[PDB]
Amino acid sequence: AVISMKQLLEAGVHFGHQTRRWNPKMKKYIFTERNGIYIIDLQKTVKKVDEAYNFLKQVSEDGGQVLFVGTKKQAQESVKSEAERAGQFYINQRWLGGLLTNYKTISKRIKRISEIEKMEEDGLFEVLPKKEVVELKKEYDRLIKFLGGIRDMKSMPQALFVVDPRKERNAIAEARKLNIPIVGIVDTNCDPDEIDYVIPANDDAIRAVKLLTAKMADAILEGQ
């Protein structure tokens, strides 16, 4: 559950953002400033972390899944790797506006993937007009790009893991509309009230994203 402090300042977790870009609601979680950068208090960080850790093992033991998001490029592979580690579902590309609120139309497109995998094996990708061969292939690749990691999600996820709340604000709006708890990693200049389980950690360092989402992946691993 707890992460050693040195594992954080080695991962750049203490790093925040410039004083220029600062949300004054982070003043509770900020510990002084270095080189004009608001250094996050690692103690507070760890504390908050080991509390979304117990909530997440609760979700995995109940049977719920966590929708990993983090379309940000620095979080892209970190989200993908640790979600499949836990058998959860991840988002790595453009968050489809209304994939949770408008699941009615998204459900057909999600099942379109498994449907598109079907015509290949039932033989109508073998008999096809020349342009339709690539046309239906193009429809596949678009869908794999977005609904690649959530193709097995059937209903609304019982939990959602946001890497950067400010970046993927479109996902948080859907979650709050359907009462979906969010575990989020806030660096600075982010709203700590738009999410419920707050991780005060750096959001740009490549290893910092990996280290915290792995512990959150460890949370599910100790629940299933």
Add this chain to the structure above:
RNA sequence: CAUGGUUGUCGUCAGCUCGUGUCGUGAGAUGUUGGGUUAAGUCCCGCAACGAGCGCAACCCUUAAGCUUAGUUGCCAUCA
């Protein structure tokens, strides 16, 4: 100038809309905007939009060249 049916017209112009979702107290908006491109909301990239339908293509006829079948009532090369 009660109408069915049929027709011109803008104009073969490329637009016209819908479902679910989202924003807006509301009329309304989005998608149908932006970066390019096309004869074409034609197509791509992105984007609170995700998908559709009537539209535009294509599909259908004729034409332009070729190959099989066919030899009359078509044709006339090898020959009289």
